[PDB]
Design an enzyme around this catalytic site. Structure first.
Site, PDB file in Angstrom:
ATOM      1  N   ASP A   1      15.425   6.910 -28.633  1.00 37.16           N
ATOM      2  CA  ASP A   1      14.808   7.289 -27.351  1.00 37.16           C
ATOM      3  C   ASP A   1      15.834   7.326 -26.221  1.00 37.16           C
ATOM      4  O   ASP A   1      16.061   6.301 -25.561  1.00 37.16           O
ATOM      5  CB  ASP A   1      13.688   6.290 -27.066  1.00 37.16           C
ATOM      6  CG  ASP A   1      12.827   6.683 -25.901  1.00 37.16           C
ATOM      7  OD1 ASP A   1      13.161   7.673 -25.221  1.00 37.16           O
ATOM      8  OD2 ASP A   1      11.799   6.008 -25.733  1.00 37.16           O
ATOM      9  N   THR A   2      16.399   8.509 -25.943  1.00 39.34           N
ATOM     10  CA  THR A   2      17.383   8.641 -24.874  1.00 39.34           C
ATOM     11  C   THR A   2      16.768   8.435 -23.501  1.00 39.34           C
ATOM     12  O   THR A   2      17.512   8.223 -22.540  1.00 39.34           O
ATOM     13  CB  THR A   2      18.100   9.999 -24.928  1.00 39.34           C
ATOM     14  OG1 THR A   2      17.148  11.068 -24.797  1.00 39.34           O
ATOM     15  CG2 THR A   2      18.878  10.143 -26.217  1.00 39.34           C
ATOM     16  N   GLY A   3      15.445   8.521 -23.385  1.00 37.66           N
ATOM     17  CA  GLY A   3      14.727   8.259 -22.148  1.00 37.66           C
ATOM     18  C   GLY A   3      14.407   6.793 -21.896  1.00 37.66           C
ATOM     19  O   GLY A   3      13.740   6.468 -20.900  1.00 37.66           O
TER      20      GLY A   3
HETATM   21  C1  LIG Z   1       7.290   5.072 -24.896  1.00 29.29           C
HETATM   22  C2  LIG Z   1       7.670   6.355 -25.635  1.00 29.29           C
HETATM   23  C3  LIG Z   1       7.259   6.287 -27.106  1.00 29.29           C
HETATM   24  C4  LIG Z   1       7.113   7.635 -25.006  1.00 29.29           C
HETATM   25  N1  LIG Z   1       7.561   7.942 -23.668  1.00 29.29           N
HETATM   26  C5  LIG Z   1       8.887   8.446 -23.409  1.00 29.29           C
HETATM   27  C6  LIG Z   1       9.933   7.377 -23.125  1.00 29.29           C
HETATM   28  O1  LIG Z   1      11.212   7.898 -23.363  1.00 29.29           O
HETATM   29  C7  LIG Z   1       9.747   6.898 -21.688  1.00 29.29           C
HETATM   30  C8  LIG Z   1      10.183   7.875 -20.600  1.00 29.29           C
HETATM   31  C9  LIG Z   1      10.064   7.194 -19.230  1.00 29.29           C
HETATM   32  C10 LIG Z   1      11.212   6.841 -18.536  1.00 29.29           C
HETATM   33  C11 LIG Z   1      11.125   6.243 -17.290  1.00 29.29           C
HETATM   34  C12 LIG Z   1       9.889   5.945 -16.747  1.00 29.29           C
HETATM   35  C13 LIG Z   1       8.739   6.290 -17.433  1.00 29.29           C
HETATM   36  C14 LIG Z   1       8.825   6.901 -18.675  1.00 29.29           C
HETATM   37  N2  LIG Z   1      10.613   5.737 -21.625  1.00 29.29           N
HETATM   38  C15 LIG Z   1      10.199   4.360 -21.573  1.00 29.29           C
HETATM   39  O2  LIG Z   1       9.087   3.999 -21.553  1.00 29.29           O
HETATM   40  O3  LIG Z   1      11.290   3.506 -21.571  1.00 29.29           O
HETATM   41  C16 LIG Z   1      11.056   2.051 -21.389  1.00 29.29           C
HETATM   42  C17 LIG Z   1      11.815   1.414 -22.124  1.00 29.29           C
HETATM   43  O4  LIG Z   1      13.102   1.343 -21.373  1.00 29.29           O
HETATM   44  C18 LIG Z   1      12.631   1.378 -19.907  1.00 29.29           C
HETATM   45  O5  LIG Z   1      13.624   2.470 -19.252  1.00 29.29           O
HETATM   46  C19 LIG Z   1      12.876   3.489 -18.926  1.00 29.29           C
HETATM   47  C20 LIG Z   1      11.499   3.013 -18.856  1.00 29.29           C
HETATM   48  C21 LIG Z   1      11.485   1.749 -19.835  1.00 29.29           C
HETATM   49  S1  LIG Z   1       6.341   8.215 -22.531  1.00 29.29           S
HETATM   50  O6  LIG Z   1       6.997   8.568 -21.306  1.00 29.29           O
HETATM   51  O7  LIG Z   1       5.526   6.995 -22.444  1.00 29.29           O
HETATM   52  C22 LIG Z   1       5.452   9.713 -23.088  1.00 29.29           C
HETATM   53  C23 LIG Z   1       6.044  10.934 -22.925  1.00 29.29           C
HETATM   54  C24 LIG Z   1       5.408  12.082 -23.348  1.00 29.29           C
HETATM   55  C25 LIG Z   1       4.128  11.997 -23.962  1.00 29.29           C
HETATM   56  C26 LIG Z   1       3.572  10.808 -24.129  1.00 29.29           C
HETATM   57  C27 LIG Z   1       4.227   9.622 -23.685  1.00 29.29           C
HETATM   58  C28 LIG Z   1       2.230  11.016 -24.789  1.00 29.29           C
HETATM   59  O8  LIG Z   1       1.434  10.190 -25.088  1.00 29.29           O
HETATM   60  O9  LIG Z   1       2.087  12.413 -24.992  1.00 29.29           O
HETATM   61  B1  LIG Z   1       3.191  13.143 -24.561  1.00 29.29           B
HETATM   62  O10 LIG Z   1       2.728  14.303 -23.723  1.00 29.29           O
HETATM   63  O11 LIG Z   1       3.812  13.674 -25.695  1.00 29.29           O
END
Ligand SMILES: CC(C)CN(C[C@@H](O)[C@H](Cc1ccccc1)NC(=O)O[C@H]1CO[C@H]2OCC[C@H]21)S(=O)(=O)c1ccc2c(c1)C(=O)O[B-]2(O)O
Ligand SMILES: [Cl-]
Ligand SMILES: [Cl-]
Ligand SMILES: [Cl-]
Lengths: 98, 99
Positions: free
Chosen positions: B25-27
């Site tokens: 997860d690069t995000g």
């Molecule tokens: C959890 C993952 C499996 C899924 N996601 C992406 C993830 O990369 C998020 C992206 C993000 C980045 C910053 C702020 C909010 C979100 N990163 C994240 O939560 O990172 C945590 C861990 O490290 C911290 O640093 C960053 C936040 C903290 S999502 O955004 O929840 C997400 C994205 C698209 C869709 C769905 C859910 C869904 O259900 O359908 B969909 O349309 O396909």
């Protein structure tokens, strides 16, 4: 380009006529903060850390991602960060390499 | 390897002797794993995801293998929907994004 991961992989995108967005291999879809887009939409719920949010799903939207054009579905709603997900990363030929 | 993104970039990880599935997860700034037992002391951490901010347990200097690559680093434990390998460990294994 080759983007290292010491910092968030943020790029400039052009959508609906400029924003900063995160290149996110962990997101199936592309999610952008509130803005207007043309055409039809339908509501959708998306969820992760911290729970779910309601978004508007617009299909067949063109986005320029770091200079590369792509077309696909874009979700619009109260995301804390603009996210470019896999649905558009594939179209610009992005890969993860190690 | 070179991993395309037509499917979710899922890999096998090994942590505490057990194999688990996780998403590259690069995000994600941080690596977040579902509830499990890890050794040592932990510290509190707040992280902010798509739906808001939550509390997790931060364990440092944890041995973890990711797709066969050995890493040692910080692992957060909490209510995440899937195990995520964030940038703190993707840098250890030498991962870059390329297009
Ligand atoms: C959890 C993952 C499996 C899924 N996601 C992406 C993830 O990369 C998020 C992206 C993000 C980045 C910053 C702020 C909010 C979100 N990163 C994240 O939560 O990172 C945590 C861990 O490290 C911290 O640093 C960053 C936040 C903290 S999502 O955004 O929840 C997400 C994205 C698209 C869709 C769905 C859910 C869904 O259900 O359908 B969909 O349309 O396909
Ligand atoms: Cl799409
Ligand atoms: Cl391809
Ligand atoms: Cl670390």
């Amino acid at each position: 380009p080759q983007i290292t991961l010491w910092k968030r992989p943020l790029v400039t995108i052009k959508i609906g006529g400029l924003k900063e967005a995160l290149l996110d291999t962990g997101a199936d879809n592309t999610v952008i903060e509130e803005m207007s887009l043309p055409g039809r939409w339908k509501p959708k719920m998306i969820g992760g850390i911290g729970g779910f949010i309601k978004v508007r799903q617009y299909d067949q939207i063109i986005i320029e991602i770091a200079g590369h054009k792509a077309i696909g579905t874009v979700l619009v709603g109260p995301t804390p960060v603009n996210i470019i997900g896999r649905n558009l990363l594939t179209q610009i030929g992005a890969t993860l390499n190690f």
